[PDB]
Structure formats: structure tokens, C-alpha cells
Amino acid sequence: NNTLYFYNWTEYVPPGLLEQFTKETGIKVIYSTYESNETMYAKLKTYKDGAYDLVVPSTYYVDKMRKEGMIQKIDKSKLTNFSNLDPDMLNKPFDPNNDYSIPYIWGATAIGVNGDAVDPKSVTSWADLWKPEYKGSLLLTDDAREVFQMALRKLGYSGNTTDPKEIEAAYNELKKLMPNVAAFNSDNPANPYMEGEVNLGMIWNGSAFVARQAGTPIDVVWPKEGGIFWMDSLAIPANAKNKEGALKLINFLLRPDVAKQVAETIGYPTPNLAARKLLSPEVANDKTLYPDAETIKNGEWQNDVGAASSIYEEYYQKLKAG
């Protein structure tokens, strides 16, 4: 009866959701996926094929979009399930009062290892991926900031640096890893491991879950230097034709049964606290999904770099060329 345009990352909405929403609301949602923020960005500033009413950027893209005037304000008064959000995902300084973004799903990037093929006790750090022996067998997520952060951490620098010298040094190191790289995948990184065309590499903790779920000896190792933490937030584009509907779609995503239902299917963790008490105990206590306080303490959240995004972005495409 109404139509809504939703652009989101690839494995987050499982078959059955959007339809459920439609049963309830009578709103028809035209769904579209993207595999990276860089992608989603270059699109929103050019076309319609992508999405207009609802998009989902990483919190590190929120200030930059907000500034370009790309996303508008969210009336959270119409978002009555907002109170279910864990308060530790709300004081963030890129949107202190959550007027432009709504926590949706969080996760981590770490080392995925093919059990029945490689000994998980043998890989312990990001540093190990540079060993000559992993030649032509590594999977890398197709994310500039995640690839830099892994090399940046291997060197002892912050993954949120804004120092071109540091970045450049990571670039240099990233060049040594080139022979080891079999693929770049931001679609569903578990896939190549399951197809078994890669032994070890980077892995999102949620897609390794859906893969185990299907019987793949995919083990997740927290690296000695960190683990890359990130969060995806719902935002409403400035040129949205249906912001009223977008706020419905958001409150739907905030009802605890919904979030509960998706998190058990896609494994990525929910910042929805209500929905967390509802989670089966095999999921809620899986430390590769809801890692302990000492482990987030040792990893680092991907944050805004500002104008320096220019350097990561360019230096990454060079890499993907070279």
C-alpha cells in the first residue's frame, strides 16, 4: 500500500523478515544490498537503484555523511522500542544523542581458520598471515579500513590513525602480504572457506557462525593484537520519499522478538538487550559472538578518521590493482 526503499549490507536480513514486516504494516519494501560503506557512499551520491528511505552505515561513516548533509534527523519519539538498546552503544561521540543513527547490529573481524585443514593453535596473531607458507591461500575481507587496521595493528599503531606516515608504513607492510592473498570478499566471506579454496584469513564473526551451522570446521581466533570491532547503524537519507515508513521499519527492527529471531539465524550480535535475554544459551554465550570484556579491551572499535579516509581509500585501491 506504501513502498519503502532499503539498502543494507548483504547477510543481515534473512529470508522471511521483510515479508513479516509487510504482513504487519502493509508496507512493501524494495530491498537492495551493498558490500561496503565505500560502495554505499558512491551510490547514494549518484543513484536510485540503491536505496532512498533506509541505509545502514558503520558508525565511522556517520559524521562524514551527516556533514555532507546526506542523512537527516530521526524522530526517536516515533521509535518506541528504542529503550531496548543497551546503553553502552549510545553515548558515542559521532552522534551523542542518537539523532542521526540507530544501533542495529555489531560484530567483529578476526582470523577464521579451516579446522580439518589447518591447526587453529598454529595461527595466533595477525602477524602470522605474513608467513611465506600461507602463499596463495588467504582470504581478506574487501574493506579498506579493516585491511589497514590488521596491518596497522601488526605494526603496533592504532587502526584509527590519522598519521599519513603510519598509514604509509601499513601500506608498505600490506605489500608484503600480496602473494598470500587468494581473495577479497565482503559479500559473505565464509563462503570461500566452505567452498574450500582458502585455508585461513579474515572472517566476520557472524558469517563463520552461519557456516559452522552448516558443518564447516571454521574456527575463530582472537588475534594477539586485537580483533576489529565495528557497528552498523540505521540512518535515513535526506532525500527519502517515505521517512514515515522508514521509522516504522526501524521500530520493527527494535522490537525484541524480531532482533532475537535474526541474531539466532545470522549470528551477528544485537545491541538490543531485551532481545539478548531471549537468545538461546548456545548463542548468547558463544564468546566469538558476545566476546568477554578482556577481549574487547584488547581489540579496537573502527572510528572516524576524517579527512584521512582519503589516504586509506586510495592506498587500498592501489593494493587491489597491485
- Collect all residues with Cβ–Cβ distance below 8 Å to 35 and sequence separation of at least 6: 9, 10, 142, 186, 187
Residue 20 marked ligand-binding: no
Residue 213 marked ligand-binding: no
The rounded distance, in Å, linking the Cα atoms of 242 and 248 is 10
Hey, what's the cell of 106? 555489531
Residue 146's Cβ-count burial label (10 Å; 0-12, 13-18, 19+) is buried
Same domain for 133 and 196: yes
Same domain for 77 and 25: yes
- Collect all residues with Cβ–Cβ distance below 8 Å to 274 and sequence separation of at least 6: 84, 256, 259
Same domain for 264 and 207: no
Same domain for 309 and 181: yes
- Collect all residues with Cβ–Cβ distance below 8 Å to 299 and sequence separation of at least 6: 108, 222, 226, 227, 228, 229
The rounded distance, in Å, linking the Cα atoms of 208 and 139 is 13
The rounded distance, in Å, linking the Cα atoms of 82 and 67 is 24
The rounded distance, in Å, linking the Cα atoms of 203 and 153 is 16
Same domain for 99 and 237: yes
Residue 52 marked ligand-binding: no
Contact 109, 204 (CB under 8 A): yes
Amino acid type, 308: A
Give me the number of domains the chain comprises: 2
Same domain for 241 and 154: no
Residue 146 marked ligand-binding: yes
- Collect all residues with Cβ–Cβ distance below 8 Å to 126 and sequence separation of at least 6: 111, 150, 151, 153, 154, 223, 224, 225, 226
Hey, what's the cell of 172? 608498505
- Collect all residues with Cβ–Cβ distance below 8 Å to 264 and sequence separation of at least 6: 279, 280, 283
The rounded distance, in Å, linking the Cα atoms of 270 and 144 is 24
Q: Residue for cell digits 579454496?
A: 197
Torsion of the alpha carbons at 172, 302, 238 and 269, rounded to the nearest 10: 130
The rounded distance, in Å, linking the Cα atoms of 164 and 152 is 12
Question: Which ranges of 97-230 does DSSP label H, i.e. alpha helix?
Answer: 144-154, 164-176, 190-195, 205-212
Q: Residue for cell digits 552498523?
A: 232
The rounded distance, in Å, linking the Cα atoms of 166 and 265 is 39
The rounded distance, in Å, linking the Cα atoms of 154 and 151 is 5
Q: CA angle 272-273-276, nearest 5°?
A: 95
Same domain for 182 and 41: no
Same domain for 187 and 305: yes
Residue 11 marked ligand-binding: yes
Helices (H) and strands (E) in the chain, counts: 12, 9
One DSSP character per residue, 53-91 reads SBB--BHHHHHHHHHHT-B----TTS-TTGGGB-GGGS-
Bridge partner list, 250: none
Nearest CA among 228, 271, 260, 227 for reference residue 101: 271
Hey, what's the cell of 188? 559473505
Question: Which ranges of the chain does DSSP label H, i.e. alpha helix?
Answer: 17-25, 37-44, 59-68, 144-154, 164-176, 190-195, 205-212, 243-254, 256-266, 281-284, 293-298, 309-321
The rounded distance, in Å, linking the Cα atoms of 78 and 80 is 6
Same domain for 16 and 100: yes
Experimental technique of record: X-ray
Percentages helix, strand, coil for the chain, rounded to the nearest 5? 40, 20, 40
- Collect all residues with Cβ–Cβ distance below 8 Å to 272 and sequence separation of at least 6: 84, 85, 86, 254, 256, 259, 260
Same domain for 315 and 226: yes
The rounded distance, in Å, linking the Cα atoms of 30 and 15 is 14
Nearest CA among 71, 136, 141, 86 for reference residue 109: 141
Nearest CA among 182, 147, 186, 183 for reference residue 167: 147
CATH for 314: 3.40.190.10
Residue 292 sits at φ, ψ, to 5 deg, of -65, 160
The rounded distance, in Å, linking the Cα atoms of 320 and 184 is 9
Q: Residue for cell digits 559472538?
A: 289
Residue 224's Cβ-count burial label (10 Å; 0-12, 13-18, 19+) is middle
Residue 191's Cβ-count burial label (10 Å; 0-12, 13-18, 19+) is middle
The rounded distance, in Å, linking the Cα atoms of 290 and 59 is 19
Same domain for 260 and 172: no
Nearest CA among 103, 121, 99, 102 for reference residue 111: 121
| Other Cβ atoms closer than 10 A to 176 | 11
Write out the residue range of the structural domain in which residue 24 sits: 1-106+231-290
Same domain for 296 and 170: yes
Q: Residue for cell digits 573502527?
A: 302
Contact 153, 301 (CB under 8 A): no
Residue 263 sits at φ, ψ, to 5 deg, of -55, -30
Contact 220, 44 (CB under 8 A): no
| Other Cβ atoms closer than 10 A to 4 | 26
Beta strand pairing call for 300-301 and 27-34: unpaired
